[PDB]
Design a binder for this molecule. Structure first.
Ligand SMILES: CCCCCCCC(=O)Oc1c(Br)cc(Br)cc1CNC(=O)c1ccccc1[N+](=O)[O-]
Ligand SMILES: CCCCCCCC(=O)Oc1c(Br)cc(Br)cc1CNC(=O)c1ccccc1[N+](=O)[O-]
Lengths: 163, 165
């Protein structure tokens, strides 16, 4: 399933299944973020996951939506962006990397979300890996599954979030 | 192998690469169709693949874009729709399925495409098989690789269709 996310009964069970799927696949931290079509800000955002509260708060308070290189990437692509040194170009972006790392989120990837009704978002997952080599090996072995996952999460989440 | 789609220059080589990748996954016929954001007709569509010419012409002339259940599905979902007379209901819909079958396009699936810039389209692929059960086994066996392929085709195809000189 393949169906279990769509066949979840409400936000709570959806969130838990999503987090559990991620957990089973090997990702201890996930965040699904979705905005309605042509959103001006994040006032109508549907954001669900198990990222630490302190980090969620820090990201909001620091305005990191405007710094985070995965955000801009999502506006330009349907392909995943892996969390690697090359995506952090400016000192501001390097600072974001360091703060995310301090919060425990070092290795991972962000999958852009583009819904059939203009929904815009991202599914981010972090793996608690020993090092970059181990992180990449793990991520390669799960990537095709995660690629299907992001679209199922999008289709179901959008239905749950905006109708 | 996905890197080859960006590496290519021109509609011809790109389409050839995509067709080969699809063939390697067990699909002998494919159609990649993509419209720019908020298109009101198909005049500005980018449509490439190896569906037979006669079928392409008939589908257009008969107005099957308004009948084909995979088309309406693509406007509503990011998930694939498998080709099944179950997705047919109306008179024209069984006409459509009958004519598609006659053209040799019986089993397959359509993967909706929703681009970062509002591009809307579909990657449709047909699989040759002895029966639907076998067709389903062939398709399920490659679904994760196809899922990646459709997004790689979308990202590279949108550039080729609408952006690159
Ligand atoms: C405009 C497009 C719609 C994007 C809609 C929001 C998508 C989203 O969830 O962005 C967030 C938000 Br809101 C809060 C946090 Br905290 C994190 C993100 C996404 N970024 C990452 O997950 C990320 C990415 C790289 C490195 C570290 C991290 N991280 O947070 O630990
Ligand atoms: C508005 C969003 C759409 C986006 C528009 C692009 C989708 C597309 O390419 O539709 C077509 C077109 Br144009 C011509 C033909 Br011929 C076929 C399709 C899509 N349908 C199938 O491939 C299909 C589907 C089911 C059964 C048989 C077939 N078939 O043609 O053999």
């Amino acid at each position: 399933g393949f169906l279990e996310l769509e066949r979840s009964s409400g936000k709570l069970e959806w969130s838990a299944i999503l987090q559990k799927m991620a957990s089973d696949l090997g990702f201890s931290k996930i965040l699904f973020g979705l905005l309605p079509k042509d959103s001006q800000d994040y006032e109508n955002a549907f954001i669900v996951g198990n990222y630490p509260a302190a980090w969620r708060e820090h990201y909001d308070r620091a305005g990191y939506a405007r710094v985070d290189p995965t955000v801009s990437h999502c506006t330009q692509s349907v392909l995943p962006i892996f969390w690697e040194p090359s995506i952090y170009q400016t000192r501001k972006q390097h600072e974001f990397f360091e703060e995310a790392s301090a919060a425990g989120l070092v290795y991972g990837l962000t999958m852009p979300l583009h819904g059939a009704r203009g929904e815009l978002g991202a599914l981010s997952l972090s793996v608690e890996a020993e090092n970059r080599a181990e992180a990449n090996r793990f991520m390669e072995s799960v990537l095709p599954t995660l690629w299907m996952l992001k679209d199922y999460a999008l289709q179901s989440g959008a239905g749950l979030a905006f109708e």
